[PDB]
Design a protein around this ligand. Structure first.
Ligand SMILES: NC(=O)C1=CN([C@@H]2O[C@H](COP(=O)(O)OP(=O)(O)OC[C@H]3O[C@@H](n4cnc5c(N)ncnc54)[C@H](O)[C@@H]3O)[C@@H](O)[C@H]2O)C=CC1
Ligand SMILES: NC(=O)C1=CN([C@@H]2O[C@H](COP(=O)(O)OP(=O)(O)OC[C@H]3O[C@@H](n4cnc5c(N)ncnc54)[C@H](O)[C@@H]3O)[C@@H](O)[C@H]2O)C=CC1
Ligand SMILES: NC(=O)C1=CN([C@@H]2O[C@H](COP(=O)(O)OP(=O)(O)OC[C@H]3O[C@@H](n4cnc5c(N)ncnc54)[C@H](O)[C@@H]3O)[C@@H](O)[C@H]2O)C=CC1
Lengths: 280, 281, 281
C-alpha cells in the first residue's frame, strides 16, 4: 500500500509518518517544494507516475486572520488543492483523506455538533476549507473528510505558545468565552488510519473527548508544566482579531460513535502525554 | 448472470421484489439482519467483496416513525449508516445501488403534488435519518437510484391489515381526514424499481400510486372493498397526538418517471383492489 | 485517438468547438436532436455503449427563456434530464462530461462579480432547470466540468444580429440599461472549454469575457462598430415586461480560471470587434 501525504512536514503529517513507521506501507511524504497541490498539471503528473493507493492531505493555509486578507491564496491552498488531489486520486483509483475544520460552523451552537448539522462558515478560513470538502466529495467517491480543532503536536501551537509566554510573563489573559476541545495529533492520526483501514468512508468529526475554554486549556497546561503564571479569564471583545472565531465549536465524534467507535481520549489525558513528550 | 443483493428482504417490498424476480434470469441473494447487518461496516465490506453483487436493493429500514424519535441513534445507524455502508461497498465492486426512501423528507406544508426537484425539510427523526441516507448513497456511488415512496402496503404489517382487524372488532372508527397522500402497493413500487434498473435510468424518483386521498378515504375504500360494516368518522390530527410530526400533505408527483420512461404505477384504488383480492384468497 | 461527442452541435457553441477542433488530432462526433435525442435514456445509453467517446460536450439546451416558463416539462427534459442521461452514460464508458450552464442560476441581486463559490438561487424556469442539470451531472459522473456562460453570441441567432437588423430598419431603439453582465463570444468560451479538458481541470467554472456593461452599452458598441446610424435610448426593465424574471446584475467573475490555469478570455469589446469583422466579410 502506497500512501501519499501532502503537507507532510506539518503537525499532523509528521504524526502520521510516525504512526506508519514499521507498518507494511510505502509512505511518500511531500510538502510544497516536492508537490505544490495548487498546480493541477503538477499534481496530475505526480499521481499518474507514482500511482498512490491513498492520498492524505494535511496541507492547508491555517493562518486564520491572514486568510481574510489572502482570500485568493486561501482558496488556492484550502479548496483548489483538495480539488486537484481528489480528481488526480480518482484517475488512478486512489482514496482521499481530506483534513478539515470546526470553522465550517458558525459558532452559534449550544451543544456538541455532529456531522449532520448544517455548516455556515463566518470566516475566509472556514469558507475556503468548506469549499475544499465540497470538491473532494464531488470528485472522488472514495473520500474521508475528517474535521478537527484546536490541534497540537509537532509544530507551532497553543501549547508551545502558552509555555513560551508563561515563562516570560507573570500573568496572562486568555479567552474564557470560546469553547471546544484541545486535540492531539496522536488521536487524530489514529482515527485517520483507522477509517482508512476499515474503508469507513464519509465525513467524521475527530476531536478529543470533553469540553473546555482556551482559558481552561491554558490553566491545565501550566498545572502540568508547573509554570507559575496567573491566568485571568477574559472575553473575545477585549482582544479583537480580523477573523470571526466561533463562540462554541465543540464537535461530537458522532460518526465514530455510530460506526466503529470513538477511540479518541479525554483531552487532559492526551495533553498530559504531549507535555511529557515535550519535557524530554 | 446478474447478481442482485436484497437487504431487508423479508419486509413488504423485499418480498415483492423476490416474487417479481422469480423465473427471471438473475441470481437473487435475499438477506435480512440475521444474514447481513447493514450497520456493520466491516461485515458489509466483506460480504460485498466475497459475493460481488451487480446491484444492491436496500429495503431495510427502521420504519417505526414514533419510535425513531426516542431511538435517534438507532434510526441513524439503520436509516443512514446502513445506506452509506451499502453504497461504498457497492462502489468498491462496481455495483449499482437502489435506496428506497420516503415522503417524510418533506415538511408536509406543500399544497400541490411534490416533485423530486422540490426542497426537502424533514421535521421528524425518521425523515431526517432517511434523508441523510439518501445523501450518503449519492455521495458514495455514482450508479445510484433513490426511490421515494409512501403509505406502503404489501406482504407485512400495514394500514390495510390494521383497518381490517380493527373494523372486524369495532362498530365505528375515527380516521384522520386532514392528512393526504396516496396509498401505494409494493407491486407498483417493485415494478418501478426493476424498470429503472433495467434502463439504467439513474437518479431520484418518486414512486407512489396515481391519485390522492386522505387516510379516512383510504379506510372507507378498504371497508367498501371488503364488505366490512363499520362506520368511519373523519377526524383531525390534533384529536389523537403522536411523538412524530406527520405531514399534512405528502402527495408525491412521479415527475421523473413522467419526464423519462413513463409513470407505470396504477391508480391507487386499482392497486388496492388487487391487493384486497389477494388477501381474501 | 481522442473521441469527442458534441451534443447540440449545430448551435452557436457547438459550431465554434467543431471549428476550433478542425485539424487537431481528435475524432469529433457532432450530433443534434435528429442524430441523438439526449432526453431519451435508452437511445443515449446505446449510443455511448456503441461509440465509446472519451468526452461528451453538451451544448444542447432549451434557451428560449420566456418559453421555458410555459414549457416547464420540456425545459426539465432538455435542460436537466438530458445532462443526467449524458453524465451517467458517459460514466458507464469512462468518459468525461462538459456541461454548459448559465448565469441564470443566480438571482440577480448581487452587487459585485459573482464567483463559482457564491450561492445559487434561480428565479426562472430556465435557471431552475439548468441548475438541476448541473446537480445531476456532478452526482452521476466524477469527471465533470460545468462551464457557466452568459450573453452569448456566435454562429446563430443572438443579440448582435438582432440589434443589427433592428438598427437597419429603425431610426431609434430602446435598450435596457438596468441589467448588467458581460457579452461573451463563443470563440472565447470554446477556447476555455477545450483548455480545461486538456488540463483535466475538473470542476465548475464561470466563463464570460472580461469586463462589464449593460445591454444598452452592448447595443451602443455594436452600432459604433458597424457604423449603423440609430439613436439608442437607455430604458428600464419595467418598461418592457417579459414572462421570465431576468437578473439585474449577472456579471460572473471567472474566478476558478484566475485561481488555476488562467483567465484566457478577452475584454468584451475586443471579442465583439473580431465577431463584427467576421460578420462583415
Ligand atoms: N491547526 C489547527 O488548530 C487546526 C488544523 N486543522 C486542519 O488540520 C490539518 C493539519 O493542520 P496542521 O498539521 O496544524 O497544519 P500545519 O500548519 O502544521 O502544516 C500544514 C502544511 O501544509 C503545507 N502547505 C502549504 N501550502 C502547500 C501547497 N501549496 N502544497 C503542499 N503543501 C502545502 C505547509 O507548508 C505545512 O507544512 C490542516 O488540513 C488544517 O486545516 C483544522 C482545524 C484546526
Ligand atoms: N411502510 C411505509 O408506509 C413506508 C416505507 N418506506 C420505505 O420503504 C422501504 C421498504 O419498506 P417495507 O418493505 O415496508 O419495510 P419493512 O419494515 O416491512 O421491512 C424492513 C426490513 O428492514 C429490516 N432491517 C432492520 N434492520 C436491519 C439491518 N440492520 N440489516 C438488514 N435488514 C434490517 C427488517 O428486519 C425488515 O425485514 C423502507 O426503506 C422504508 O423506509 C417509506 C415510507 C413509508
Ligand atoms: N444563449 C445565451 O446567451 C447563453 C447560453 N447558455 C448556455 O450555453 C449553451 C450553448 O448555447 P447556444 O450555443 O447559444 O445554443 P443554441 O440555441 O444556439 O443551440 C442549442 C442546441 O440545442 C439543440 N437541442 C435541443 N434539444 C436537443 C435534444 N433533445 N438533443 C440534442 N440536441 C438538442 C438545438 O437543436 C440546438 O442545436 C447552452 O447550454 C445554454 O444553456 C447559457 C447562458 C446564456
Amino acid at each position: 500500500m502506497k500512501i501519499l501525504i501532502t503537507g507532510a512536514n506539518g503537525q499532523l503529517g509528521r504524526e502520521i509518518q510516525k504512526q506508519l513507521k514499521g507498518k507494511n506501507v510505502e509512505v511518500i511524504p511531500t510538502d510544497v517544494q516536492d508537490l505544490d497541490i495548487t498546480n493541477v498539471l503538477a499534481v496530475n503528473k505526480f499521481f499518474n507516475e507514482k500511482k498512490p493507493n491513498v492520498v492524505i492531505n494535511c496541507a492547508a493555509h491555517t493562518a486564520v486572520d491572514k486568510c481574510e486578507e489572502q482570500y485568493d491564496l486561501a482558496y488556492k491552498i484550502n479548496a483548489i488543492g483538495p480539488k486537484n488531489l481528489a480528481a488526480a486520486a480518482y484517475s488512478v483509483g486512489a482514496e482521499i483523506v481530506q483534513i478539515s475544520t470546526d470553522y465550517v460552523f458558525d459558532g452559534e451552537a449550544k451543544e456538541p455538533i455532529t456531522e449532520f448539522d448544517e455548516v455556515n462558515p463566518q470566516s475566509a478560513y472556514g469558507k475556503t476549507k468548506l469549499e475544499g470538502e465540497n470538491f473532494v466529495k464531488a470528485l472522488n467517491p472514495k473520500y474521508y473528510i475528517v474535521r478537527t480543532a484546536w490541534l497540537y503536536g509537532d509544530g507551532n501551537n497553543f501549547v508551545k505558545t502558552m509555555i513560551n509566554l508563561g515563562k516570560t510573563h507573570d500573568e496572562l489573559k486568555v479567552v474564557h468565552d470560546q469553547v471546544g476541545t484541545p486535540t492531539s495529533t496522536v488521536d487524530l492520526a489514529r482515527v485517520v488510519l483507522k477509517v482508512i483501514d476499515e474503508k469507513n468512508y464519509g465525513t467524521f468529526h475527530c476531536t478529543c473527548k470533553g469540553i473546555c475554554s482556551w482559558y481552561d486549556f491554558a490553566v491545565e497546561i501550566f498545572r502540568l508544566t508547573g509554570i507559575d503564571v496567573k491566568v485571568t479569564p477574559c472575553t473575545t471583545e477585549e482582544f479583537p482579531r480580523p477573523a470571526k472565531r466561533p463562540k462554541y465549536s465543540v464537535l461530537r465524534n458522532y460518526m465514530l460513535e455510530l460506526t466503529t467507535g470513538d477511540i479518541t481520549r479525554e483531552w487532559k489525558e492526551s495533553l498530559k502525554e504531549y507535555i511529557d513528550l515535550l519535557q524530554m
